[PDB]
Amino acid sequence: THIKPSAQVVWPIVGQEILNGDVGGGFQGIQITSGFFQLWRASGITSELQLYTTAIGGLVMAAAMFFAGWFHYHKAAPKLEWFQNVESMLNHHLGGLLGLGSLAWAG
């Protein structure tokens, strides 16, 4: 309630270190407004170790996505009538993406 959420710190070179304002908590940085700290309290993070490890997991998952696009374009790319199965795409996206994803977030 008295400490401003800050998650961007600048480098003190050309006088731009005035942007590292007194956000509180013994810390200087830019007061963020994207709401990540309230997400992280609502998720139960309580430590920057958990933030660092889900950042490493995000790099791993970004490499998984880049490898996936490389794979499904260059190595094993789906045919046209794979994409035209919109009933299966809707069953899997209502069931697996939206349904199982909110079941997992419920967990």
Partner 1 sequence: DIAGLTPCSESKAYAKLEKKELKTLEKRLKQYEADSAPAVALKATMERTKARFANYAKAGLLCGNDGLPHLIADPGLALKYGHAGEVFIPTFGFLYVAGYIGYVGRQYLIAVKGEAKPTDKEIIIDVPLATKLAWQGAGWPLAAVQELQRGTLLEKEENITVSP
Partner 2 sequence: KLFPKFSQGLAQDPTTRRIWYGLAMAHDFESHDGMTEENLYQKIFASHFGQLSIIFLWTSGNLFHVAWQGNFEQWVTDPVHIRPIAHAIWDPHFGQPAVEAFTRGGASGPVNISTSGVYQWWYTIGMRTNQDLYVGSVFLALVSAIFLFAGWLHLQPNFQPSLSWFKDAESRLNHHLSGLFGVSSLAWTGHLVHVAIPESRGQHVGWDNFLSVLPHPQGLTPFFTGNWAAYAQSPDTASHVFGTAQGSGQAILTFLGGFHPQTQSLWLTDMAHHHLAIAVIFIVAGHMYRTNFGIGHRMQAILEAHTPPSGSLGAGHKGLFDTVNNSLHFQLGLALASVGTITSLVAQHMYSLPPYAFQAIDFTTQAALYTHHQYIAGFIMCGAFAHGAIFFIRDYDPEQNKGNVLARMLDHKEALISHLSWVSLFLGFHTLGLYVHNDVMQAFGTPEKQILIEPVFAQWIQAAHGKALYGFDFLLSSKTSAAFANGQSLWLPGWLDAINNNQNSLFLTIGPGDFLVHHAIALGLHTTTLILVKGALDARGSKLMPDKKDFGYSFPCDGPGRGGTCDISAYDAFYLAVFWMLNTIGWVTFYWHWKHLTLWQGNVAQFDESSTYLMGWLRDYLWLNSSQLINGYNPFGMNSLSVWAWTFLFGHLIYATGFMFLISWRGYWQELIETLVWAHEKTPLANLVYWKDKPVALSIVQARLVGLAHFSVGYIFTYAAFLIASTSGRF
**Interface with partner 1 by CB under 8 A: which residues?**
12, 17, 20, 22, 26-28
Q: What burial class does residue 20 get, using C-beta atoms within 10 Å of its C-beta: 0-12 exposed, 13-18 middle, 19+ buried?
A: middle
Q: Which does 22 bind (CB under 5 to 8 A by kind): partner 2, ligand CLA, partner 1, none?
A: partner 1
Q: What is the dihedral of CA 4, 105, 54, 17, to 10 degrees?
A: -20
Residue window 33-72: x/- pattern of binding to ligand CLA, with contact defined by CB under 6 A: ---------------------------------x--xx--
Cα–Cα dist 96/107, whole Å: 15
Q: Which of 8, 43, 53, 88 binds ligand CLA (CB under 6 A)?
A: 88
